[PDB]
Design a protein around this ligand. Structure first.
Ligand SMILES: Cc1cc2nc3c(=O)[nH]c(=O)nc-3n(C[C@H](O)[C@H](O)[C@H](O)COP(=O)(O)OP(=O)(O)OC[C@H]3O[C@@H](n4cnc5c(N)ncnc54)[C@H](O)[C@@H]3O)c2cc1C
Ligand code: FES
Lengths: 419, 104
């Protein structure tokens, strides 16, 4: 109602996005954005790209100019942490004692970086040892990308690869270790891992897969790390160490309140948790994917934008929109990587173009269904693949590989013969 | 340089651009909910979509194949002056431009 209080915990992309979207769909009640971060809400993708390269201003990171919040009558309560949720009393209690009343609650808590087990003690606290999840992390790391200095990145995910490529361009000596048998092991077919490994080895990255760090060596000062130690006995000397071994969803708040949790805050088709008045969105939310018929938790910008809009709709009585093809992207060196859909469980792949060039598309299929598409420097085939998945078009598999037949036509042909 | 976004329902919102910044970045950062730029302004999603008026349809870095390829997917109607606001770097020689926010 126009006398209904909505409280949003977390001021990341997801949270500020339901706040402004909520106001754009007609919501008239009060809107409280409570986050523990103290900085102005900003984008994350640039923290391992242009901003890390130092080629973008801190201001260009702003999600919204700091004055747009007052203009939309969105109360932004920074530097504030929510410690608990009193469901029956229907309020959230802060650390500074205050209790906020709510009629509608949205958990947009995101996640915290998974700690590296042997980074305990003085290691984690070193200034030359860092995780890459915050603005501080990025600025702290950016100042240490000193030419000829050595860098050891631990973690094979996309952020890790984007850090290595940034460091290479900064003229650092870089080594990347992953416990998996290949980078992006779980999310990509062998040939796409091969492509990334060649690209980075060719650029000068020492990539040791199947490696597991067992400890670190510190300066006699105990203020900085000097080397990384692997289960295989090698000692990798390092001036800087960046770890990116994953994310842990911040579901504590929900678990403590009795809301069902399982590697994320569980939510239904309407984004609601076990409590009708409480919804969750973004990195922290585990939901049942309509398109893939499986419980999943996406950590991406499109997924957060999509879920926040779904929430805005539901709370404003609008009819929610169909699950869109999830997508994600990564920039490494000058290569544009764009991935739509989720490849897990594919029975085969179909390559459109040649894996020998930095220009091709990889289609992952399950039977005659397209689950996902990895594209390299192919923004247009990439964008067109979204409808294949979003609209579940029965595209002809035996044509995906024939580049003489435009993808628009192949899609158009399917979009006309759904039967 | 100033930009004028003839937004939703007919209304309009005029703004300030640091010059060298795309109309998309400026719009979404100031609350022009009418236009979103999901992809980040790399010309990969087409949610930047805007109708540029003939008043300025010229001297606006003609959309290349990338954009044309993207534009095609615009959920709204595709017009001869449709462009990706994210591929429009505001410059002095473009003061007082008027972009049309397609219907969401
Ligand atoms: C370096 C980096 C690069 C990335 N690159 C890409 C990319 O290229 N493409 C892509 O699609 N995605 C990318 N992503 C991921 C994308 O940016 C995120 O998935 C998205 O921003 C996640 O938004 P979020 O709102 O869910 O949560 P978060 O950003 O985690 O924010 C949740 C916020 O809530 C706060 N919070 C949590 N608990 C509490 C509490 N109890 N009280 C108060 N505040 C609390 C958190 O501390 C945090 O600030 C990247 C992420 C990183 C870190
Ligand atoms: S923001 Fe994606 S094409 Fe403009």
């Amino acid at each position: 109602n126009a006398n209904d209080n909505v409280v949003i915990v977390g001021t990341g992309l997801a949270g500020v996005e339901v706040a402004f979207g909520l106001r754009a769909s007609g919501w008239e009640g009060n809107i409280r954005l409570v986050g523990d971060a103290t900085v102005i809400p900003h984008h994350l993708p640039p923290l391992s790209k242009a901003y890390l390269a130092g080629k973008a201003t801190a201001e260009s990171l702003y999600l919204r100019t700091p004055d747009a919040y007052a203009a939309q009558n969105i109360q932004l309560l920074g530097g504030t942490q929510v410690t608990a949720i009193n469901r029956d009393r229907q309020q959230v209690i802060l650390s500074d004692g205050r209790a906020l009343d709510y009629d509608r609650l949205v958990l947009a808590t995101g996640g915290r970086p998974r700690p590296l087990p042997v980074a305990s003690g003085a290691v984690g606290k070193a200034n030359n040892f860092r995780y890459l999840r915050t603005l501080e992390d990025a600025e702290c790391i950016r100042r240490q990308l000193i030419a000829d200095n050595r860098l050891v990145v631990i973690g094979g995910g996309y952020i890790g690869l984007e850090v290595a490529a940034t460091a290479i361009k900064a003229n650092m000596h870089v080594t990347l270790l992953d416990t998996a048998a290949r980078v992006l092991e779980r999310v990509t077919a062998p040939p796409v891992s091969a492509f990334y490994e060649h690209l980075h080895r060719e650029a000068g990255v020492d990539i040791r897969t199947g490696t597991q760090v067992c400890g670190f060596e510190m300066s006699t000062d105990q203020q900085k790390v000097t080397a990384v130690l692997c289960e295989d006995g090698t000692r990798l000397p390092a001036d800087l160490v960046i770890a990116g071994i994953g994310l842990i969803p911040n579901c504590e708040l929900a678990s403590a309140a009795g809301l069902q949790v399982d590697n994320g805050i569980v939510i239904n088709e309407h984004m609601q948790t076990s409590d009708p008045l409480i919804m969750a969105v973004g990195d922290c939310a585990r939901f049942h994917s309509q398109l893939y018929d499986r419980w999943v938790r996406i950590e991406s910008v499109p997924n957060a934008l999509e879920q926040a809009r779904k929430i805005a709709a539901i709370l404003c009585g609008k009819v929610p929109r169909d699950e869109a093809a999830p997508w994600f992207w990564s920039d490494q060196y000058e290569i544009g990587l764009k991935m739509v859909g989720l490849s897990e469980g594919y029975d085969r792949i179909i390559v459109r173009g040649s894996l020998a060039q930095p220009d091709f598309s990889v289609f992952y299929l399950q039977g005659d269904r397209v689950l996902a598409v990895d594209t390299v420097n192919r923004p247009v085939e990439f964008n067109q693949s979204k409808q294949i998945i979003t609209d579940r078009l029965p595209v002809e598999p035996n044509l995906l590989g024939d580049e003489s037949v435009p993808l628009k036509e192949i899609i158009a042909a399917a979009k006309a013969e759904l039967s | 340089s100033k930009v004028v976004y003839v937004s939703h329902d007919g209304t309009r919102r005029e703004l300030d651009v640091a010059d060298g910044v795309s109309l998309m970045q400026a719009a979404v950062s100031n609350g022009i909910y009418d236009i979103v730029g999901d992809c980040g302004g790399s010309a990969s999603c087409a949610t930047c979509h805007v109708y540029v008026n003939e008043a300025f349809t010229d001297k606006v870095p003609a959309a290349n194949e990338r954009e044309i390829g993207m534009l095609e997917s615009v959920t709204a109607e595709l017009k001869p002056n449709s462009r990706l606001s994210c591929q429009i770097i505001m410059t002095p020689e473009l003061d007082g431009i008027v972009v049309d926010v397609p219907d969401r």
